[PDB]
Amino acid sequence: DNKLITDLSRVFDYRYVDENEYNFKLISDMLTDFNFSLEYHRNKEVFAHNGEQIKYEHLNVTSSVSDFLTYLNGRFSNMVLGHNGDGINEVKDARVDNTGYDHKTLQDRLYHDYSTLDAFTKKVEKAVDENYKEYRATEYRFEPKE
Amino acid sequence: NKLITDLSRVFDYRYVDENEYNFKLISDMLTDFNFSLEYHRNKEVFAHNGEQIKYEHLNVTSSVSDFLTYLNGRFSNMVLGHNGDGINEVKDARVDNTGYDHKTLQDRLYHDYSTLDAFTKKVEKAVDENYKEYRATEYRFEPKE
Amino acid sequence: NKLITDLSRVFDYRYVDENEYNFKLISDMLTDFNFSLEYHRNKEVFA
Amino acid sequence: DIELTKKDGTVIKLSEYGFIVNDIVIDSMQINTKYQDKENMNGRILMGSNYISRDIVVPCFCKVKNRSDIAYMRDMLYSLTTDIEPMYLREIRRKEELNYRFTQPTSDDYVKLDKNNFPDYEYSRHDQQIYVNGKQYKVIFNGVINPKQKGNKVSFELKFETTELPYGESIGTSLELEENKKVGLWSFDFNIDWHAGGDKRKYTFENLSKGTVYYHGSAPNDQFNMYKKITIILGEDTESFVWNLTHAEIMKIEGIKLKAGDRIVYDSFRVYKNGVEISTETNISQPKFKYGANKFEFNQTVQKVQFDLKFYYK
Amino acid sequence: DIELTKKDGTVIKLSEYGFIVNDIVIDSMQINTKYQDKENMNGRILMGSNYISRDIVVPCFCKVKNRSDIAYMRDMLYSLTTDIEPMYLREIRRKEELNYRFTQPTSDDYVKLDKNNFPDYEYSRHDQQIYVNGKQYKVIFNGVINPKQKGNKVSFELKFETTELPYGESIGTSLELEENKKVGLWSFDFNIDWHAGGDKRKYTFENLSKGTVYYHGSAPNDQFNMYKKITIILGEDTESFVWNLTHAEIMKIEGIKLKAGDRIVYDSFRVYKNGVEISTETNISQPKFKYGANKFEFNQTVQKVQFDLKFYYK
Amino acid sequence: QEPEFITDLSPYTNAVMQSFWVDPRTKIIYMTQARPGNHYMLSRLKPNGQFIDRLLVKNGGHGTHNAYRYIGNELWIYSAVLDANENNKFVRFQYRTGEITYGNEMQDVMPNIFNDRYTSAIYNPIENLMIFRREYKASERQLKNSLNFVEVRSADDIDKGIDKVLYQMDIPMEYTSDTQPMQGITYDAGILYWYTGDSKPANPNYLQGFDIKTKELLFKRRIDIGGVNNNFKGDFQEAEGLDMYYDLETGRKALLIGVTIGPGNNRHHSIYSIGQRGVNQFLKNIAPQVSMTD
Amino acid sequence: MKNSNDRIILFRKAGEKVDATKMLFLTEYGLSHEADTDTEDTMDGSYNTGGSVESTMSGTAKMFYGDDFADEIEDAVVDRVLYEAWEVESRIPGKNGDSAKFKAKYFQGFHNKFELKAEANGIDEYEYEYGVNGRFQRGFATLPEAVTKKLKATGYRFHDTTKEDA
Amino acid sequence: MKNSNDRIILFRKAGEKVDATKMLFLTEYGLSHEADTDTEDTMDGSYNTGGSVESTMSGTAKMFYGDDFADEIEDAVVDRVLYEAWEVESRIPGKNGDSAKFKAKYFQGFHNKFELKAEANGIDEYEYEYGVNGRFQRGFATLPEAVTKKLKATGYRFHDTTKEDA
Ligand SMILES: [Fe+3]
């Protein structure tokens, strides 16, 4: 849009004040427009980036997401499967848990998942309990010995 | 390189130059930010890390890097993962992780997930109660007493 | 935002005080915009 | 680049009258020295040294639509400027070398033209020129010739000259500095604090034996022709009344008896005992403000002092 | 190339104030002759010949960021320089025509820019300019015009002029030479031995009828306006007191009786018998130091002589 | 946060409170003022303000701030003093009522390495650090565009002689100029608080707390603790030295700030604080305010 | 990697509220931005203070019957008419919210020279040199419909034989 | 025994803290170091006292779509912006503890002239003449990564037939 008034008057008058005023109004509108554009890019704007602008690194394998999707579609359209039985492929597919690391047995997978969740929630509860204890101590601190 | 929010208190050429440089810098910095965002949005390679972007299925939230690694792990397991005795695998999976053989795999999975959900909801109720007690002790305003 | 678009029309220190306050707001705003942008770029989760 | 002139009874500016100007150049003040050479001594005594005159020069040209009109325009210039009547000149500058801005050649957003056939680069309100400084000059004209270059363009070479005192008289008193009523007339050339009511803005003190003054003017206000004017409510009865001052001389008022509530208007080399009927026989000495701190010292805690003056520059 | 000015109450230098200078050129001293032509004789008598004035010239220009500011800057110049107040000018030079140094164009080791838009070639502390010599000049200003070349560049042509005596007054006395306390103010233009306390540095002698002095100044200190000032503890009682000197006249003090421990302050053409109540009726003759060896001869072995003076140059 | 009043100081000498520092393990305030000449007073007082005693450092410079270290119940004062108008010495000593001057009673610390320029120090006991403020000469300043620079270093290193200049940082002019002189410093948690003031009302005195690690500006607020808004006793308020009050127990750090108010020949030194939920309360409740009666 | 044909010239008379006028059949073209260094050198250094520019733009053309524009250029030269002109490069459109606009260089001045030439059985060409008032301004410009349709300039599309069409 | 292609040009705007910018597609090039002999000749001898140099460097180029640098040069010429430029000869590396650095000639000034030209169905080239403030400085300089990767400039590596690749 119209640029700011870089050069001001060299005498204090209504003109100098109006110059600073107009410059500040233009700055407010510029900042609001930029913040709106940023929120629109961050939340509402569709087809913002075209895939290739994204990183994807795993096991020291860096590559773009738009290339890795093509690689996966290729591997899938080249994947071969046999009618091993009445659910063998199905169970073999279920043997993973959301992060790769194919388990040797579905039972091992379920045990590992349940164990991870138990350890996580139990560690959470321990953190809760020690935080509550710390807060009660800090609040009701009555330690006349120190 | 940055603004001067410490203006001279004598109204001289110093002050006027400070104000002028200030507005010039604001314009320059703003147009630089706009161009930077545009470069980010259009041409910046590897603008975002893959862990960031969210992939929302039904009632499910996850990144794209995790999801892609999971797809790749699925492919790898289905291809080079040994298989066999699936019926025995299922009938053995029927048992839970404490030493009790359920009747069916779905019932076992349901019991396990319900146990976890109940434990988490109990923890959550304890957390909410603890937080509410802390608030009522901290921001206490009871002119009844 | 929150800028004073009605400056004192009088040759007094209130003018420079509100000018300095406006510039402090502008500086803080540009800085947090740059920080938010950097966060969105290479630190934010579910950007 | 307008060369404003405030005459006794009117205000004029040239570019309003179709008179562009090329520039304004203001000489410094012609220092007349007064040396005396001792007969056989390798060095000459300074009897004195003194500012005299600040000769201004302003070449201005003018374009018109037809050759005849030149005559009219020229006469207007003379009738408008060449005035033995001591005028007050004010200089004007621009803040930028303005250009034409971007437009669109789509049978729209065409360009403007001034009353004179020129391209109006002044699109917005904030384009046109400004009183570059809050001062003036007491000025008189000297001889001009009018070479007519081709067409309707003719040049002139105004040679103005200072009238009374070779100084940059600051417009507006020091009380308009005190009471921030009048707006304009205060440029950043004067290093003036914003703290109105604070020190180095105030020339209105109360109930003090001694106080402080910041004369923002680089040139010294020792000359009486300057509008240095003091007025004091004396606060306490007395028979004699001395007040001292730095960068100036001592002042007495002896031999006349006064009273507390009576006020003295102390004009330059002049003393109104009570506003009229001047009693100025007592210690004819005039005060002198040089620059910055001009500390005064009364002797019996006047209940009021206040004094307006004009700032002068070199 | 800074043109330092020490005024009565302050110190100023132009390049601090955004005022570059092109150069400084210092004329010699205008020799006013006094000849008389005999009527029919192929030759004219020299009545006298005498130095008068050392006219300095300094053209200085200035750049600013915008066209308006020119005005302010110009006014500053006038308010900063054009002073009838006798000032003390000190010249400055550079030791080298400095260039920009080698750097690396690797998004690093970029170049600096001054407050004015220029390239800072002064990378290290030892780059900037120096007081080229330990002397000054008593100086006053003469008229200037300000042609504005394009943009924000405007030139000025200062024309300074000597005030009292056309000489290169050396700053600092001869006692600062004696006591090596003050540092600076001693340039190699003065051929000064390092042997502090040795001969040709000392102006503080004891218990001597006759002694030796090396006046390092090429110009002669015969003029009283120079700060030649002697003070002597007479050592021995007497009724009369003569002392002779070479490159000068004989001096007597007859008709007044003195005492040994009493001291005489012998200022230029002036005699404090005991520091006040000047008894200067006796043989009004002033001493004159020309250059190099200025041998004095007292008559009764003063217990102390010491005298500070200022070195003057042509 | 907004500062909170604690106390006023009652030194029996009329001058400005150039700085102050309270001690945790003793509840005693040492306040430094600069007397006419290079000499300077430091008054040891109670928390309420009552006068215990004083010491006069002769030729001790302005004494803008001094570091107070505790080495196993032994109070060392690191200070800046010059002797015989030679140069600035950074010197250790012990408190003693009356008079002192550089000589046998005061021992320098590694003189050869930083007695080339004006230097002063503060002490942070939590990290056991000795933050050295070190001024610049005029010639170096011409290129640096700055007056002073702050070095971090460790007190054990200073003791056993080894020098380390980790975390050095210049200060731009605008934060130390004539209208914004230094007037106080204190380090805490990788953050250097720099409190400046103009000794003039409506020239807003405030602090400019920034970071030393990465050489940035963290924050910059305004301060009007002289009293009611733009109406202070006398005609001027002046900012003064800082202090970070720790505690041997309940390690709750608070930031104490000195202000000096009132007309020309009569001063009022007050201590405000920004606290950490109880620090200021305990500080003022150590001992009561003096009253004419019980 | 840029064919000059791409660049396009637009003209207009300042105090005329109409759309621009392309300049057809210009063979050569040139745009010189000279400078005069207002430099002042100390006796112990050197400095540049300012610069007075002498920009200008030169062009040729070929005088086809259809357009009378060359006559307008000539009238400008001899009558000293102010003319605003801009080269608007085709095939370089706007970036942000700008697609029909095209990169440009807009400048105003007076035509300080114009001169034609012609030989036997030869097209009659001419050469004009145009000043530039001060500094020019760059900025994305849109073209007028007229210039757009001219830009296409397709030639003798497929007709048919034996009287179907001329 | 030295092909010009080897020599490389780097530019940068002074008050900009960024890495240099190569100048692509320059056909010609020249670097003139004139001198003005401040000589004073006695009536019984001769002498040279000093010399005022008038160094400068000229170059052409070809205005490819990709880079907007020529626009920067032009903005300089018209706006009098100070630029620092150095030719850094490739294939002449450092000798002692210097391998990535390359011989160079560093100098700064203002672009005193710039002028393009263009003909029908022809690439649009231009010519710039750049002053030199005082004496230049020589010194082994390192290049920025960008310039290094550009220097390679391999062309249309082996692709494949029947749809494996474009
Ligand atoms: Fe994004």
Numbering used by the authors:
A (entry chain BG): 2 to 147
B (entry chain BH): 3 to 147
C (entry chain BI): 3 to 49
D (entry chain BD), E (entry chain BC): 1 to 314
F (entry chain BI): 148 to 441
G (entry chain EB), H (entry chain BB): 4 to 169
Sentences from the paper on this structure:
The baseplate is a complex structure at the tip of bacteriophage tails that serves multiple roles, including host recognition and binding, cell wall penetration, and ejection of the phage DNA. We have determined the structure of the baseplate from bacteriophage 80α, a representative of phages involved in host pathogenicity and in the mobilization of MGEs in S. aureus. Phage 80α is a typical staphylococcal siphovirus with a 43.8 kbp genome and a 63 nm icosahedral capsid, attached to a 190 nm long flexuous tail that is capped by an ornate baseplate. Here, we have determined the cryo-EM structure of the 80α baseplate at 3.75 Å resolution, allowing most of the baseplate proteins and part of the tail to be modeled in atomic detail.
Atomic models for MTP (gp53), Dit (gp58), RBP (gp61), and parts of Tal (gp59), FibL (gp62), FibU (gp68) and TMP (gp57) were built into either the C6 or C3 baseplate reconstructions, using I-TASSER models as starting points, complemented with real-space refinement in PHENIX. In total, 72 polypeptides comprising 7 different proteins were included in the final model. The baseplate is 298 Å wide and 271 Å tall and consists of six peripheral structures surrounding a core that represents a continuation of the tail. In a complete tail ring, one of these β-sheets forms a 24-stranded, highly negatively charged β-barrel—42 Å in diameter—lining the tail lumen, presumably providing a slippery tube for the DNA during infection. The Dit hexamer constitutes the hub of the baseplate, forming an adaptor between the sixfold symmetric tail and the threefold symmetric Tal protein, as well as the attachment point for the six RBP trimers. The Tal NTD (residues 1–331) consists of two tail tube domains (TT1 and TT2) that form a quasi-sixfold adapter to the Dit hexamer. In the Tal trimer, these helices form a twisted tripod that occludes the opening of the lumen. After accounting for the plug and rod helices, there were three additional, well-ordered α-helical densities forming a second tripod interlaced with that of the Tal plug. This density matched the C-terminal residues 1135–1154 of TMP. RBP is a trimeric protein consisting of four domains: an N-terminal α-helical coiled-coil “stem” domain (residues 1–142) that is folded by 155° at a central hinge; a five-bladed β-propeller “platform” domain (residues 143–442) that was previously suggested to bind to the GlcNAc residues of WTA on the host cell surface; and two highly similar C-terminal “tower” domains (residues 443–636), each consisting of a bent β-sheet superposed by an α-helix. Six such trimers surround the baseplate core, making up the bulk of the observed peripheral structures.
